[PDB]
Amino acid sequence: LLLKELRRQEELLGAEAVAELYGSDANGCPLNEAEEKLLQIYRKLHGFPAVDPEAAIIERCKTRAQRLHGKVDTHGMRKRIFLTPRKTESYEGQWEDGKFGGFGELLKKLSKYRGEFRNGLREGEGTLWLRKDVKSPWVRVYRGEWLAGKRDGVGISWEENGDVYEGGWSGGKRDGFGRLFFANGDIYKGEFRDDQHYGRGILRLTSGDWYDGYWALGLREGPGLWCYTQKQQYFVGEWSKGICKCGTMLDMPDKTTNENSRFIPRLGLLRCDEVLELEQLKLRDRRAQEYPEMNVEWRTPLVSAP
Amino acid sequence: TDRKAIIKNADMPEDMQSDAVEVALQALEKFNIEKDIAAYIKKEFDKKYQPTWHCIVGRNFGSYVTHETHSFLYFYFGQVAILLFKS
């Protein structure tokens, strides 16, 4: 029976995905629900090491508001209560001073949430689910800290497009240190503000190429280093509005072969450093004019890490 | 240290400019006269990418050319300057 269960899940998710998932490791992105329960089945069969978040959450909440005599508001443990007489919304959880003040389950027409509460709004750790309509089943997107109904913390996201994100959150938007995993397989480690790459970041693609540079307004913007790993060639220059125009091109030190990429000849411009310098001064002037008061080095200077 | 290629004006996706510098090196290895280098580079880009591309190669010049987006590159390596645009 266990083998039947495991095999039907494996054919449900896909054999390629199952084999890939066996090759996964803890440094990877947090899995979605199907992979999670597939691995639970696989482990409970094999014994291929134990965690429970709900236990810790409930551990945290029991110290909160308690029974008080003659209080004229809810202020306590309750069963399900409908917020409207039309029966479209419902909640089941503790109360404080007539508002949501503890851990409770909330059901909307299209959303459902389980987490802690403080003064009527979301202040704690919680998980969020969504559904397209009343017929569609639940789809999970969120896991992270809450404050005043919006995401002020470090959390989990599984975007609708198929992306998955890790990083800080503030004002309900991506803000802080974060790691982004794209649907096509790209990996981006960077620093986010205003749901764009407004900071220092490191990017690496599926084909092996990898990036170090600064980012602004969602595009590549600053001084940085790029490496063409298969060709053993690396590029250093300045980016402005998604595309770089000034740079120096060099071969990696260990190149010894005439085959993968040809060698750069050994002559160049006179005093080239001055010319490049003049160019990024031009770019900086135009940048300041087009986007004044902007700062690419907002919490990590270049001098700290070459 | 002395071996260096520098890009000083660019509107070009980056893998394409890597391809461009590779094939420019091939052009230098095969030929010596500027005109044949230009012919080879233009025909090669017109083959891999759709027509029409243009190329001007030399040592002392000044130029004013318009181009459509993501189709411009200008850089130094070795002995000669390369200007490339699609139009």
XYZ file of N, CA and C in Angstrom, chain A residues 1 35 81 105 107 109 112 131 133 151 167 178-179 187 192 194 199 204 260 289 295 304:
66
model
N 0.825 -1.203 0.000
C 0.000 0.000 0.000
C 0.860 1.255 0.000
N 5.484 18.594 -3.378
C 6.807 18.037 -3.132
C 7.011 17.751 -1.653
N -17.214 32.300 14.433
C -18.150 33.419 14.468
C -18.185 34.064 13.095
N -7.963 31.224 12.930
C -8.133 30.882 11.526
C -9.215 31.759 10.915
N -11.370 32.807 7.323
C -11.810 32.316 6.024
C -12.521 33.435 5.283
N -13.854 34.674 1.127
C -14.465 33.998 -0.010
C -13.391 33.478 -0.963
N -7.669 32.489 2.710
C -7.746 31.857 4.015
C -6.378 31.921 4.672
N -7.534 30.899 -3.657
C -8.229 30.075 -4.634
C -8.886 30.973 -5.673
N -11.769 30.488 -7.385
C -13.193 30.633 -7.121
C -13.601 29.590 -6.092
N 3.306 42.949 5.326
C 4.418 42.041 5.615
C 5.666 42.831 6.013
N 13.443 36.569 1.306
C 14.052 37.837 1.651
C 13.249 38.571 2.694
N 17.804 39.453 0.187
C 16.923 38.450 -0.375
C 17.609 37.559 -1.381
N 16.992 36.408 -1.632
C 17.410 35.467 -2.658
C 16.208 35.155 -3.532
N 19.271 32.042 -10.737
C 19.441 32.316 -9.315
C 19.923 33.749 -9.160
N 16.940 44.125 -1.981
C 15.727 44.587 -2.642
C 15.144 45.806 -1.947
N 11.462 48.331 -2.851
C 10.336 48.750 -3.691
C 10.050 47.705 -4.774
N 19.707 47.692 -5.109
C 20.843 47.439 -4.242
C 21.902 46.588 -4.904
N 23.383 34.586 -11.143
C 23.974 33.440 -11.820
C 22.903 32.748 -12.647
N 38.465 27.159 -26.790
C 37.138 27.605 -26.378
C 36.889 29.065 -26.736
N 21.057 63.834 -13.629
C 20.015 64.664 -14.224
C 18.709 63.892 -14.373
N 20.653 56.900 -5.064
C 21.873 56.398 -4.433
C 21.924 54.889 -4.624
N 34.100 47.853 0.447
C 34.021 46.743 1.390
C 34.303 45.404 0.722
